[PDB]
From a paper:
BMP-9 and BMP-10 are TGF-β family signaling ligands naturally secreted into blood. They act on endothelial cells and are required for proper development and maintenance of the vasculature. BMP-9 and −10 are synthesized as pro-proteins and processed by furin to release growth factors comprised of two cystine-knotted protomers that can covalently homo- or hetero-dimerize via a single cysteine in the dimer interface. Unlike other ligands of the TGF-β family, BMP-9 and −10 are secreted as a mixture of disulfide-linked dimers and monomers, in which the interchain cysteine (Cys-392) remains either paired or unpaired.
To further understand how these residues contribute to growth factor dimerization, BMP-9 G389S and BMP-9 G389S, K357R disulfide-linked dimers were crystallized at both neutral and low pH. For the crystals where the datasets were split, the integrated diffraction data was split using rebatch in the CCP4 suite to take either the first or last 32nd (or first 64th for wild type BMP-9) of diffraction images from each crystal’s 360° datasets. Where the serine is present, its sidechain hydroxyl is unstructured at neutral pH. Since wild type BMP-9 is radiation sensitive, the BMP-9 mutants were checked for radiation sensitivity. While the trend is not clear between mutants at neutral pH, the damage is decreased compared to wild-type. Similarly, the double mutants further improve BMP-9 disulfide bond formation but fail to further impair BMP-10 disulfide bond formation.
Numbering used by the authors:
A (entry chain A), B (entry chain A): 325 to 429
Amino acid sequence: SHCQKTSLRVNFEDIGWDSWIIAPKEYEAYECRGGCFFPLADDVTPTKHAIVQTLVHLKFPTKVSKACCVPTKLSPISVLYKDDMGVPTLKYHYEGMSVAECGCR
Amino acid sequence: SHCQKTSLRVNFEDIGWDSWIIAPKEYEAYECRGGCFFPLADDVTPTKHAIVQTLVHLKFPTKVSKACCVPTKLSPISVLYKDDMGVPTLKYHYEGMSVAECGCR
Ligand SMILES: [Cl-]
Ligand SMILES: [Cl-]
Ligand SMILES: [Cl-]
Ligand SMILES: [Cl-]
Ligand SMILES: [Cl-]
Ligand SMILES: [Cl-]
Ligand SMILES: [Cl-]
Ligand SMILES: [Cl-]
Ligand SMILES: [Cl-]
Ligand SMILES: [Cl-]
Ligand code: NA
Ligand code: NA
Ligand code: NA
Ligand code: NA
Ligand code: NA
Ligand code: NA
Ligand code: NA
Ligand code: NA
């Protein structure tokens, strides 16, 4: 039940972006889900700060929060978008749209 | 009430590291606290994925979690630690120990 990449299919209409994104209608964004708690998994690539904070959280759970399972690497997708001239234009690498890797931070 | 760096003073004894860290006894680790919710602040440097996920969370709050306020840059501290030869040694830049910057991820 540890920090990992899971599916997350996003509809641009649902998030109000269909005003400018023509296509695609949906994409696989993924998400990072799971706990950052001891014992850790081999590949959650935990920073020292995440480790320290997790230990502090254990000792003081009402005052300090645990580390968070977040994207640590993102990948691009292509989008067809409306130009200011009102013309569909391809944005070939629209960066930061999809999770490549997750970790505790 | 947005994502930012706040104080977090860590005692190494409290987290079980006084077995190997001789000094210092405590340090300022900081932590990242606050919400990742619209409207965003100017300097939470949000990735596109964090923005998309936050919007999906709004539409589907029981199924998708919000973005997380995490460290996006860390700084070193110096520690005096016990060597395998049982001798105090300085580790001048012990990396990743203190928060330099926070953001939504
Ligand atoms: Cl562990
Ligand atoms: Cl680190
Ligand atoms: Cl491009
Ligand atoms: Cl290419
Ligand atoms: Cl881009
Ligand atoms: Cl905003
Ligand atoms: Cl981005
Ligand atoms: Cl060093
Ligand atoms: Cl130096
Ligand atoms: Cl180091
Ligand atoms: Na997957
Ligand atoms: Na959606
Ligand atoms: Na507490
Ligand atoms: Na290519
Ligand atoms: Na501060
Ligand atoms: Na402490
Ligand atoms: Na829901
Ligand atoms: Na120096």
